[PDB]
Amino acid sequence: HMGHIQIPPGLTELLQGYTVEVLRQQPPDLVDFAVEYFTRLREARR
Amino acid sequence: HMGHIQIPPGLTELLQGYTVEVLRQQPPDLVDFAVEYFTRLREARR
């Protein structure tokens, strides 16, 4: 079928990274650390 | 007495809720979305 797509990848390498950051720094509150990582991602390139 | 390293639970349960809305909303960029989700969660904790 030439019209049935709805599952863009990319969420894998992204989530895995969070697993290596949260485990490396081991912050007290992940909620705040979560907003810190992604928010900074907006300045990584785009 | 028997020492080792383990992982704190909650991380999987958190991304699970995020993984859901990501598909339901099907936003164009997950980066900004991820920042809008966790950042909004803080509003729940007082």
């Binding site: 599952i7 969420l11 894998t12 | 999987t12 991304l15 699970q16 993984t19």
Partner: peptide
């Protein structure tokens, strides 16, 4: 380290849905 093992399986669960949503 062990994190590379626990973080590798945790992802397998999230991708099991995002990739299985456009098929079943």
């Amino acid at each position: 380290d062990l994190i590379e093992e626990a973080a590798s399986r945790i992802v397998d669960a999230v991708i099991e849905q995002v990739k299985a949503a456009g098929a079943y």
